[PDB]
Amino acid sequence: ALSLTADQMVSALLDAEPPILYSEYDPTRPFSMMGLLTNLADRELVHMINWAKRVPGFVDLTLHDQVHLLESAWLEILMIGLVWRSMEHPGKLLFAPNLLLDRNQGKSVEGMVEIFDMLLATSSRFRMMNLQGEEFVCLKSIILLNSGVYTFTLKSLEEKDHIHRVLDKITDTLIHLMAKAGLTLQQQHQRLAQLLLILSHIRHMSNKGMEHLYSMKCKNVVPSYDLLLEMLD
Amino acid sequence: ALSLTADQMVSALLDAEPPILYSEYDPTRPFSMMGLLTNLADRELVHMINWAKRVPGFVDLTLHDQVHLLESAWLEILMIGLVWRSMEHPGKLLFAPNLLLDRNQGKSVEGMVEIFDMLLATSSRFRMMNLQGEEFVCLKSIILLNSGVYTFTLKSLEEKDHIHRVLDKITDTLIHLMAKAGLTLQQQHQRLAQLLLILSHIRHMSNKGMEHLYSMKCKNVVPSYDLLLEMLD
Ligand SMILES: CC(C)CN1CCc2cc(O)ccc2[C@@]1(C)c1ccc(/C=C/C(=O)O)cc1
Numbered sequence: 001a002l003s004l005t006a007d008q009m010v011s012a013l014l015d016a017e018p019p020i021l022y023s024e025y026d027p028t029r030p031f032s033m034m035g036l037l038t039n040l041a042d043r044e045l046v047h048m049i050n051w052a053k054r055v056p057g058f059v060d061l062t063l064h065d066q067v068h069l070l071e072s073a074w075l076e077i078l079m080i081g082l083v084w085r086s087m088e089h090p091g092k093l094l095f096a097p098n099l100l101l102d103r104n105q106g107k108s109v110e111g112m113v114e115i116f117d118m119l120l121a122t123s124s125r126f127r128m129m130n131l132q133g134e135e136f137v138c139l140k141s142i143i144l145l146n147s148g149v150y151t152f153t154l155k156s157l158e159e160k161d162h163i164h165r166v167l168d169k170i171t172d173t174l175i176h177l178m179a180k181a182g183l184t185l186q187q188q189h190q191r192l193a194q195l196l197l198i199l200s201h202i203r204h205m206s207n208k209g210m211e212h213l214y215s216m217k218c219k220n221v222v223p224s225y226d227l228l229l230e231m232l233d
Numbered sequence: 234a235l236s237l238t239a240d241q242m243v244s245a246l247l248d249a250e251p252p253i254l255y256s257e258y259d260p261t262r263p264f265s266m267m268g269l270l271t272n273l274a275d276r277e278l279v280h281m282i283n284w285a286k287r288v289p290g291f292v293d294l295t296l297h298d299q300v301h302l303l304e305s306a307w308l309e310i311l312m313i314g315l316v317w318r319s320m321e322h323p324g325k326l327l328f329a330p331n332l333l334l335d336r337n338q339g340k341s342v343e344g345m346v347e348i349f350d351m352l353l354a355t356s357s358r359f360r361m362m363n364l365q366g367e368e369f370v371c372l373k374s375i376i377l378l379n380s381g382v383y384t385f386t387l388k389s390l391e392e393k394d395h396i397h398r399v400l401d402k403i404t405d406t407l408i409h410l411m412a413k414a415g416l417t418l419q420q421q422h423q424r425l426a427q428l429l430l431i432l433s434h435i436r437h438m439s440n441k442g443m444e445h446l447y448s449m450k451c452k453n454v455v456p457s458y459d460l461l462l463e464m465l466d
């Protein structure tokens with residue numbers, strides 16, 4: 001994991017990529033948006049667990065630390081996947097290939113249009129930077145590893161140290177991709193920063209979305225510790 | 234602003250630095266924690282406005298964009314200042330030189346100890362990285378410029394472009410500082426990433442803290458648009 005080259009890191013991440021899922025609704029019936037979106041998110045989470053298990057370094061950690069990292073990152077990870085899928089659909093969010101929604105469609109649930117707008121703006125930003133696939137898979141792994149690493153014993157100290165070393169390797173990998181594409185050393189550092197700074201915004205979006213979900217006050221919304229632990233164990 | 238050298242950027246930021254304020258309580262009287270903390274934050278905000286006005290590039294923007302950026306960033310900026318002040322006080326938060334508080338003192342307000350713990354962990358992280366003063370002032374300017382830039386006309390497009398160019402200059406400046414301290418090119422990129430990734434955590438802390446403040450349901454808590462506009466105008 002720490003012994004991987006940049007090219008091997010990129011290949012491993014590209015190979016771990018989850019599939020694009022479809023919404024479950026009968027397309028022959030007239031057109032619950034939140035029901036459809038929740039069911040989709042539920043099914044995505046299962047594939048997210050399998051993906052996480054394939055990110056180099058992640059299964060080197062304890063089970064309890066894997067659960068903590070996923071608990072902190074899951075909504076950010078769904079969000080960055082959505083934004084990526086939506087990049088070539090200006091003004092629309094591609095929740096699934098059969099569920100491409102605009103901001104006006106978001107207005108049907110109190111509080112949702114604000115979150116829709118933020119996600120659309122992030123997609124616009126990705127389009128302006130011309131984000132590449134190989135850069136995207138790196139960023140998504142950085143989110144997994146970083147989002148919970150500040151909120152966790154000798155074992156904990158070793159785990160945090162390992163997470164930081166894996167993150168360094170992903171940083172090396174990003175810069176290598178940018179070097180391969182022909183950017184100058186200045187451009188490399190500038191773009192690295194531009195990418196990492198978007199991750200703060202993805203965090204913000206996730207916090208706003210978690211507030212929405214918690215506000216539903218429902219046991220069948222937001223995956224519990226125990227459900228994540230059961231799927232990861 | 235865009236014509237500044239790295240060294241001139243660092244000098245301008247170091248010169249803009251606000252003062253360290255004191256809590257207002259009679260030290261001869263027996264020991265309201267939230268009252269003291271709110272009064273301190275109120276007075277800090279005034280100095281924050283003056284600081285912001287001295288960050289290169291910031292007064293090149295429209296008044297409405299300056300207000301938006303401050304509205305998005307103010308709590309992150311107070312938080313990164315607190316964490317910096319607290320760096321050489323393991324297990325304590327130096328809200329002011331006469332108000333140095335531990336996690337047990339946070340437990341006196343429902344919900345506060347969790348936020349205290351996060352801030353202490355960030356201080357610990359800064360101590361482990363050995364963050365320098367010159368790096369800190371850069372990060373604080375990046376927060377000002379970046380936090381609201383994804384949530385904003387031809388003028389808006391020009392403003393966002395300018396913000397991104399100033400952010401590039403701050404990135405150049407960081408790397409120059411790291412080059413001046415003798416780090417290799419690898420170490421430079423690795424540390425740049427490590428620093429920027431902590432900014433996601435500061436965002437998260439701020440969202441958690443904003444949720445606390447809004448939950449108070451009080452007109453004399455959280456600065457309004459109009460108050461920020463009045464102070465900035
Ligand atoms: C308000 C946000 C939490 C809505 N998010 C936006 C990001 C996103 C990305 C997806 O790829 C699929 C769905 C979503 C939704 C629409 C969403 C996320 C989670 C849930 C509920 C999950 C649960 O209750 O366990 C519902 C909608």
Ligand SMILES: CC(C)CN1CCc2cc(O)ccc2[C@@]1(C)c1ccc(/C=C/C(=O)O)cc1
Pocket residue numbers: 270271273274275277311312314315328345348442443445446453454455456
């Ligand atoms: C719950 C958090 C919002 C508490 N924060 C933590 C960061 C911080 C940094 C300071 O340097 C000074 C105070 C604080 C406090 C304790 C804080 C921040 C804002 C307010 C209220 C501001 C307002 O009501 O306008 C109260 C406490």
